[PDB]
Amino acid sequence: NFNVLFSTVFPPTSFGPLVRKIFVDGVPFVVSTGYHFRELGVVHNQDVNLHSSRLSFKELLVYAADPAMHAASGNLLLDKRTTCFSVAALTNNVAFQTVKPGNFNKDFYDFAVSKGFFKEGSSVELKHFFFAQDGNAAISDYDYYRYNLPTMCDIRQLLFVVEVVDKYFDCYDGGCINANQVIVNNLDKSAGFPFNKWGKARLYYDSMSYEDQDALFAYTKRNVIPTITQMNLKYAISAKNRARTVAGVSICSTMTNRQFHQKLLKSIAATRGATVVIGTSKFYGGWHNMLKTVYSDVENPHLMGWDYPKCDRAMPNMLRIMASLVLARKHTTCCSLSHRFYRLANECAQVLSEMVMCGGSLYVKPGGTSSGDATTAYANSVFNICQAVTANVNALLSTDGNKIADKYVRNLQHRLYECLYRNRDVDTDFVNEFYAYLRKHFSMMILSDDAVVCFNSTYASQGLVASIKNFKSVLYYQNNVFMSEAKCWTETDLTKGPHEFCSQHTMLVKQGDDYVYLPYPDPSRILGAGCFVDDIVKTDGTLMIERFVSLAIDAYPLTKHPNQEYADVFHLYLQYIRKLHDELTGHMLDMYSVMLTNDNTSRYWEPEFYEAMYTPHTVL
Amino acid sequence: FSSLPSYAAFATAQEAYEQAVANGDSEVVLKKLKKSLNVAKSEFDRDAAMQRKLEKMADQAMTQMYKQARSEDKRAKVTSAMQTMLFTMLRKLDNDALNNIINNARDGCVPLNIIPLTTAAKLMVVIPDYNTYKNTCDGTTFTYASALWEIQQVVDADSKIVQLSEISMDNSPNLAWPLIVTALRAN
Amino acid sequence: AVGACVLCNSQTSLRCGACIRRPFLCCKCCYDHVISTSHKLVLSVNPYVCNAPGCDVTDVTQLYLGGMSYYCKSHKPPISFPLCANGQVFGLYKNTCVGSDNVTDFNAIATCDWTNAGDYILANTCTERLKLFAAETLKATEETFKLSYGIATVREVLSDRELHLSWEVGKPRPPLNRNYVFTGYRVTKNSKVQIGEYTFE
Amino acid sequence: AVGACVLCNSQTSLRCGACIRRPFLCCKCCYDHVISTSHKLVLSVNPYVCNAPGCDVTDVTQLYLGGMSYYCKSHKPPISFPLCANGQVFGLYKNTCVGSDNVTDFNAIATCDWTNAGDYILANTCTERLKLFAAETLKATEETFKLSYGIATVREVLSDRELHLSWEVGKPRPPLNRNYVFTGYRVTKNSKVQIGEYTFEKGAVVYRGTTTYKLNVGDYFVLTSHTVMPLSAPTLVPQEHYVRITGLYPTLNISDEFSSNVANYQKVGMQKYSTLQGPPGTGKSHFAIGLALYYPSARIVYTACSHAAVDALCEKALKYLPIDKCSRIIPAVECFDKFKVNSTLEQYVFCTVNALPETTADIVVFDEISMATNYDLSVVNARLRAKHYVYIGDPAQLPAPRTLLTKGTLEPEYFNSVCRLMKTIGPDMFLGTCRRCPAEIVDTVSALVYDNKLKAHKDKSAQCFKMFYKGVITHDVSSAINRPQIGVVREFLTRNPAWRKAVFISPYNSQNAVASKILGLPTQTVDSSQGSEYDYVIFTQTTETAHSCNVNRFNVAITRAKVGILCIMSDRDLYDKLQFTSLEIP
RNA sequence: GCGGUAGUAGCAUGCUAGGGAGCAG
RNA sequence: UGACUGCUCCCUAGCAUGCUACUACCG
Ligand SMILES: [Zn+2]
Ligand SMILES: [Zn+2]
Ligand SMILES: [Zn+2]
Ligand SMILES: [Zn+2]
Ligand SMILES: [Zn+2]
Ligand SMILES: [Zn+2]
Ligand SMILES: [Zn+2]
């Protein structure tokens, strides 16, 4: 906290990797043997050898991921398009990347029009398209890191909020695992910066044996390895016309972050009935179970949801450090005290402030999160819980204590002030008491910066529980953003669920004998997915009929909506599926002579196959 | 599947038993036929099953070892490629200015952000518009980072040569404006 | 992919693996192409070959169509039906095929080295499209037997119209007049560079 | 892990584990080699050893395959499968083998521990890849033998031409002269530091090296054993006499360096190789120099076998050929750096086979064939792939330092493949012109091996002397001494005034060191001392045993001196063959 | 007379592996 | 040029378990 304030005086060219000259068989290299953080000060590597013989495979991998050689063997660059610090240009040309439009499925559009759709004055219309971008879009989108400013925190209050958050994250287990227990899916994805010139992640997960991976992972508990992050543009459907960009982290960072965090990440995504709902599905009655869990037994229930403007471009560094420290608290037996600090330093040097490669040039990332590391959603959930806790603390500590009728709450406020500003060490009994109070009067359900809260209403009116205004104030003074209350909702009737959670609305329908909650999407999104595609994937439905089956699975609960076009969407999808099947069979029987059969294929255009996906009895 | 060790015995016993049956002998020879053929087929059963299990096991082993060999070959070639890339990028370090600024350090360590700033030979500037251009690289030589640079070439967003005589205020709206200026360190 | 075999009037996706122009032959037509001569390899939308890693079978007469793939004889998962069976080869248009009465058109003129007079004799005893196949195969054989001789080059130069010339490794030299234009290319280090048009007599 | 087997050239994945060089063996070849020989270890992509925990068996005929690992009789699962069966080991490409019948000779090559003459007989009597494998394993065993020696513990130095140096405990004194190079590396605190390329004189330690270092503490003198790389090219390429002179350009004029050099070119321009069959000082030097300017537009390579024999390699090249046309290749030991190092484009490169800048040519010259093995021929054929080349050297010279053989001497037919290639079918070239030499060597080596194709060019005044003295031999250490040399040098310089400035051939280098300590004569090496001979030399007794005197060590020693060649009859020499003047000692 | 065992065929259930596709943060 | 997670549908291959069936051996 003090280093953050003091680092704003010193010049910005004295931060980052520290390099020196080493000799390998009489030839000189330039490698990084330390780091200078704005928050953590000066860090020196522990195992550095100047004179050495011919190097091995993992040394080649480490030296090929360091930005030192790439920056030192490049040209100077002065870029006036952005205000962020610039390092070097790797080539003699600047690359401009564009985004192409979508492909039009005319047959589906004609079929939909021939059934009374897209008429004037209708309540269902297309507002999801593929937007195109011009040459200078990647740099324009990268220039949004100017909203990240150095922020000092109230340390005596953060040191209590972190205890409450750790109480929230208490029902799991974690630790370190060996290289043979790591689970990777889709090994056919990109590998990072230097490495995408020779293969995908399969090449590097096959060429490296198990003890090589173990030695590489054990190397990062005594040294710091800075890497390079590549920025890519997305090609997907959306409702707004701004460019979207994701970050591609290097393989040397992901390979070790998996071994560090995967056990805890898998343990979190396997628990039901907790605050974090990552891993729970919405089919087979999952949505109803989540909604019933979040309602708990609150006394005067209302519902509330909020929004984070520029969530990843504006999150201060201190909260990211806090999230990493909270996640790394499960290593009390497998790791020492220096190993944990060096792991934290490696994480900070790789995914918090490092060189990014936009276009064909190297830039310096000021701060924030790089969406695309191995621990994105869980860290976002920790950050969301931290913000909710500090909002509750600020709401309770800023109330006239002479007007609180209940004496228990008055004593709680007195003890809260004493534990914040008059106590130096942790007091577990009051932490447990405050955690119980929060869980009784303020219930949460969190999924990576999306949240729904069921709170006591009279307590919030009297000021003993956080409100929207408290969230606005906390965001203003701790996140450097303004949160307009036009993107937040409030629901005073519990028979209708949250107004929006994970882009889905909620309706209470009668199925069987009882009443359950079902989610339904926006009809415009489903129709836009039907009509606008990437080529070959559609514009010929017979080649892929399984797209429309999934799209009709997503659009089933629209048949219980009081509005009439909403069910017509599902019926139109069923008729299109039947038409595509008939087209395929006849269109194949005609020129060729192969005769097709309709055995157990009619199930796809009858509603009973889709009705079974929302009825509790987990058949897969 | 036809020349198994027990096949000869099984077939010979079957042929002899069926010849005895075709001889129309008493029921005792028929009972002996049935017992002998039953035990013969029973003993042929495992000899026909175990061999088929073993062949599939051997085939799986062969496939796994082949894929291991392919993985090793790929590892060797990627190692060669990485070594070549490193030794190729080594040859542009300008080993006199770099040595001159390394020796001035009190322990050999220097920040990475000041190596291109003090040892690079070429500079690239990207200019949004003309107002920014006339404040940064006006003329033929300009000063930046406490050094003197002289212009060598100017191209546009389409990578076509542009002469400085036509970068003016009147002619500004006729150029693909993300201009890139290349200069060399003077003296 | 989908071309046309016309003597049997059969759209096809098959083609002979080892032949002149990758010619197109229907199921029965590829069959009597592969039994009247020796052409034991075919090409379809995908090539027929065992798909287990490390396996190698050029022949098609013993491959099987397995689990959305092809497997073989020496390395045999035989839960399938054979590819080559019942007077036909497996592919599309396996039902709408006719066959050929004159079995040895390809077996006669596509099986010799395309230099005897019999080639042209049969080409004139053909139809319009059959003789089109003939003419295209004559152009193909012209080029494919022209690409079997040397490349002239001047390494030290002399006065124009009187130079020195070394040629190639072991290959023979074609006829001598200006029939063959010596219009090659120049190499600086990896690329091709403006040379012009020449002729050596 | 995948390649061709040394006999069938078929694809395999099996490596024999009981052969020091780990050759690639075919599956049928693997079975034949493992059955008829106690070579019971086979390596694959994974080793063929029992993986049962706590177990240790390294056979191949004993293991059973089960599950995914390999198991033995004591741990075979119910689902087991023997690896060694059907006379064919289990490995990749098992169905695409052909086998071979040349397994007995391959077994003999593998099993031969290199003891007797038959070792080299069968080394030179086999097919090509077996020749390559035999040469590789011969150099491997000799380098292992010489690395099985101690480290020279040194902590101080007296002065120049003096040294105190100690070997290890249980290790004997290594061989003496530069034939076994002494190149060591000391340590200061953390790594190794340079010492110098040296050689020792006696046991007083004079320095016959070419540098002087601040030698004292922590010094480690060692005969550096080097890892041997595998061969690529065969020992020789079969020649075919051309009709076109491709690339070769006989100039309009005649660069008349030598007269018969025109015929030289005439028959070396068509066949894929040749050889300069040169008696000492008989055009063995500058015929290539004449070829340099008669064929000036031809890429010409020059090489030898040792860094010592570069005299004629380097002198006349700069002396008469143009300055720029020459080029120098030297690792950086101490040798002639007269031409330009670090230059890839040139037409006349002069070096040794130690290290060259990888390129191909069309003309090469290669010196010192007598002490050249098939390994050196293969490496020069691999590094340089030319159109024609000449191997300078003569069978009437010394063998390579093949200290491995002790029973039978290695004769001309056993030098290398080429050295008998020109012995059976005849030499590519045969000269008969001695540049500067009386007819003593003419008579001697023409009656012995030259077959009298060269005759008297300079007159025979019979000033050379050979006496009736015999001598007495005594062994002490791996070098011996001679009392009828300690007394005999004086007894032979008693009154004859002509051989006081003669050169001392050294069958025993320690004896030459003692002679230098007592009376004083220059030390003259035997093997690597051709062309360094002066005008006047003494052939001394120095030995009677089978160390040096059967035929081919004195064929060049008789040519060291020109007029006054004192070659006394020492032992069972060629006494009753010629006429020689004699003076009887008092 | 009943049970056990050994192969063979059809059917059902849950995992692992491979491929194609959909949604969400 | 194509990031990190979560859930779901379809197709094929293998393994394990269970149900039924057909022969044969044994008591
Ligand atoms: Zn740990
Ligand atoms: Zn054909
Ligand atoms: Zn046909
Ligand atoms: Zn196969
Ligand atoms: Zn062996
Ligand atoms: Zn073999
Ligand atoms: Zn064992």
Cβ of residue A269 near strand F, that is under 7 Å? yes
- Check A141, A373, A450, A568 and give the catalytic one: A450
Question: CB of D26 within 8 A of CB of D7?
Answer: yes
Question: CB of A262 within 8 A of CB of A183?
Answer: yes
Distance in angstroms (rounded) separating the CA atoms of residues D517 and D559: 26
Per DSSP bridges, beta strands A16-24 and A51-52 are: parallel
Q: How far is CA D248 from CA D266, D291, D294, D382, in A?
A: 11, 11, 10, 22
Q: Is A450 a catalytic residue?
A: yes
Q: How far is CA A273 from CA A165, A296, A317, in A?
A: 17, 11, 31
Cβ of residue A619 near strand E, that is under 7 Å? yes
Closest CA to D298 of D256, D262, D249: D249
Q: Is A448 a catalytic residue?
A: yes
Dihedral through CA D468, CA D470, CA D471, CA D472, nearest 10? -150
Same structural domain for residues D500 and D416? no
Same structural domain for residues D408 and D273? yes
CB neighbour list of residue D332: distance below 8 Å, 6 or more residues apart: D341
Distance in angstroms (rounded) separating the CA atoms of residues C115 and C111: 11
Dihedral through CA A541, CA A545, CA A546, CA A549, nearest 10? 100
Task: Return the SS3 of D296.
Answer: coil
Distance in angstroms (rounded) separating the CA atoms of residues D236 and D384: 12
Phi, psi of A74, rounded to the nearest 5 degrees: -130, 175
Closest CA to D15 of B59, D5, D28: D5
Distance in angstroms (rounded) separating the CA atoms of residues A506 and A290: 12
CB neighbour list of residue B163: distance below 8 Å, 6 or more residues apart: B154
Question: How close, in Å, is residue D549 to chain C by CA atoms?
Answer: 51
Same structural domain for residues D410 and D503? no
The two structure tokens encoding residue A451: 């949240």
Tell me which method was used to determine the 3D structure.
Answer: cryo-EM
Angle CA(A123)–CA(A128)–CA(A132) in degrees, nearest 5? 150
Closest CA to A225 of A246, A263, A254: A254
Distance in angstroms (rounded) separating the CA atoms of residues D173 and A234: 75
Question: How close, in Å, is residue C82 to chain A by CA atoms?
Answer: 19
State the distance from the centre of ligand 3 to the C-alpha of C9, rounded, in angstroms.
7
List chain C residues with CB under 8 Å of A591.
96
- Count of alpha carbons within 13 angstroms of residue C123, beta-carbon side: 17
Distance in angstroms (rounded) separating the CA atoms of residues C189 and D460: 63
Task: Return the SS3 of D409.
Answer: coil
CB neighbour list of residue A532: distance below 8 Å, 6 or more residues apart: A102, A103, A104, A105, A128, A129, A130, A237
Q: How far is CA C195 from CA A371, C150, C154, C177, in A?
A: 54, 17, 11, 20
Same structural domain for residues D417 and D445? no
Dihedral through CA A201, CA A206, CA A212, CA A213, nearest 10? 40
Question: What secondary structure letter does DSSP report for D297?
Answer: T
The two structure tokens encoding residue D39: 């070579």
Question: CB of C13 within 8 A of CB of C2?
Answer: yes
Q: Using a CB cutoff of 8 Å and minimum separation of 24, what contacts does A588-597 make?
A: A591/C96, A592/C92, A592/C93, A592/C95, A592/C96, A593/C94, A593/C95, A593/C96, A594/C95
H helical segments located in A241-316: 251-268, 286-295
Question: CB of D471 within 8 A of CB of D569?
Answer: no
CB contact under 8 A, B86 and A76: no
Distance between alpha carbon A135 and the CA centroid of its chain, in Å?
Answer: 27
Tell me the residue range of the domain where D469 lies.
Answer: 439-567
Distance in angstroms (rounded) separating the CA atoms of residues A500 and A506: 8
Closest CA to D25 of D5, D53, D4: D5
Question: CB of A294 within 8 A of CB of A452?
Answer: yes
Q: How far is CA B3 from CA B6, B9, B44, D81, D88, in A?
A: 8, 11, 12, 19, 20
Restricting to B residues 91-150, those with a Cβ less than 8 Å away from any Cβ of A are 92-93, 95, 98, 102, 108-117, 119-128, 132, 136, 144-145
- Using the CB atoms, write b or e for A267-305: b if 16+ within 10 Å: ebeeeeebbbbbebebbbbbbbbbbebbeeebeebbbbb
A128 marked among binding-site residues: no
- Count of alpha carbons within 13 angstroms of residue A113, beta-carbon side: 9
Question: CB of D528 within 8 A of CB of D553?
Answer: no
Distance in angstroms (rounded) separating the CA atoms of residues A348 and A427: 30
Same structural domain for residues D502 and D461? yes
> What is the crossing angle of helices A523-531 and A546-554, to 10°?
170
H helical segments located in A282-375: 286-295, 317-327, 337-351
List chain D residues with CB under 8 Å of C74.
95
Distance in angstroms (rounded) separating the CA atoms of residues C153 and A305: 80
Distance in angstroms (rounded) separating the CA atoms of residues A412 and A434: 8
Same structural domain for residues D273 and D355? yes
Distance in angstroms (rounded) separating the CA atoms of residues D468 and D493: 15
Cβ of residue A138 near strand F, that is under 7 Å? no
User: C95 touching A, CB under 8 A?
Assistant: yes
Question: What secondary structure letter does DSSP report for A461?
Answer: H
H helical segments located in D101-153: 104-111, 117-123, 128-147
Distance in angstroms (rounded) separating the CA atoms of residues D401 and D412: 14
Task: Return the SS3 of A619.
Answer: coil
Which residue positions of C form the known binding site for Zn(2+)? 5, 8, 16, 19, 26, 29, 33, 39, 50, 55, 72, 75
Element (H, E) at D272: none
Q: How far is CA A96 from CA A87, A134, B28, B153, B156, in A?
A: 19, 9, 96, 19, 12
Question: CB of A528 within 8 A of CB of A236?
Answer: no
The CATH number assigned to the domain holding D332 equals 3.40.50.300
The two structure tokens encoding residue D487: 């007394």
Q: Which nucleotides of E are covered by protein (CB under 7 A)?
A: 6-8, 14, 19-25
User: B75 touching A, CB under 8 A?
Assistant: yes
CB atoms within 10 A of CB D147: 12
Positive/negative CA dihedral, A534, A540, A542, A548? positive
Amino acid at D42: V
DSSP-derived secondary structure for A62-101: HHHH-HHHHHHTSEEEEE-S-SS-EEEESSSS-----B--
Distance in angstroms (rounded) separating the CA atoms of residues C135 and C123: 8
Chains contacting chain B through 3 or more C-beta pairs under 8 A: A, C, D
CB atoms within 10 A of CB A349: 22
- As a whole number of angstroms, the longest Cα–Cα distance in chain B is 124
Q: Over the Cα atoms of chain C, what is R_g?
A: 23
Question: What secondary structure letter does DSSP report for C116?
Answer: S
Element (H, E) at D58: none
Composition of chain B by helix, strand, coil, percent to 5: 60, 15, 30
Distance in angstroms (rounded) separating the CA atoms of residues A518 and D449: 108
Question: CB of B156 within 8 A of CB of B162?
Answer: yes
Distance in angstroms (rounded) separating the CA atoms of residues C138 and C195: 30
Question: CB of D99 within 8 A of CB of D9?
Answer: no
Question: CB of A555 within 8 A of CB of A569?
Answer: yes
DSSP-derived secondary structure for D59-98: -STT-EEETTEEE-TTT--SS-EESSBTTB---TTTTS--
Q: How far is CA D207 from CA A259, C55, D181, in A?
A: 61, 64, 12
D351 marked among binding-site residues: no
Same structural domain for residues D366 and D472? no
CB contact under 8 A, C166 and D95: no
Distance in angstroms (rounded) separating the CA atoms of residues B28 and B32: 6
Question: How close, in Å, is residue D93 to chain B by CA atoms?
Answer: 9
Per DSSP bridges, beta strands D69-71 and D64-66 are: antiparallel
The two structure tokens encoding residue B56: 């599939």
Per DSSP bridges, beta strands D363-366 and D388-391 are: parallel
CB atoms within 10 A of CB A589: 12
Distance between alpha carbon D292 and the CA centroid of its chain, in Å?
Answer: 27
Same structural domain for residues D462 and D360? no
Q: What is the CATH number of domain B97-185?
A: 3.30.70.3540
DSSP-derived secondary structure for A524-556: HHHHHHHHEE-BTTBS-GGG--HHHHHHHHHTG
Same structural domain for residues D312 and D459? no
CB atoms within 10 A of CB B68: 15
Q: Is A429 a catalytic residue?
A: no
Task: Return the SS3 of D481.
Answer: strand
Distance in angstroms (rounded) separating the CA atoms of residues A597 and D351: 81
Same structural domain for residues D346 and D446? no
Distance in angstroms (rounded) separating the CA atoms of residues D562 and A69: 65
Q: How far is CA D432 from CA D132, D394, D428, D457, in A?
A: 34, 13, 14, 10
Same structural domain for residues D341 and D365? yes
Phi, psi of C166, rounded to the nearest 5 degrees: -105, 155
C19 alpha carbon, closest ligand: 2
State the distance from the centre of ligand 3 to the C-alpha of C160, rounded, in angstroms.
56
User: CA–C1' distance A232–F1 (Å)?
Assistant: 7
Question: CB of A419 within 8 A of CB of A393?
Answer: no
Same structural domain for residues D402 and D455? no
Distance in angstroms (rounded) separating the CA atoms of residues A570 and A112: 12
Residue of B nearest to D66 (CA): B57
Distance in angstroms (rounded) separating the CA atoms of residues A521 and C104: 66
The two structure tokens encoding residue A572: 């139109």
List chain C residues with CB under 8 Å of D246.
166
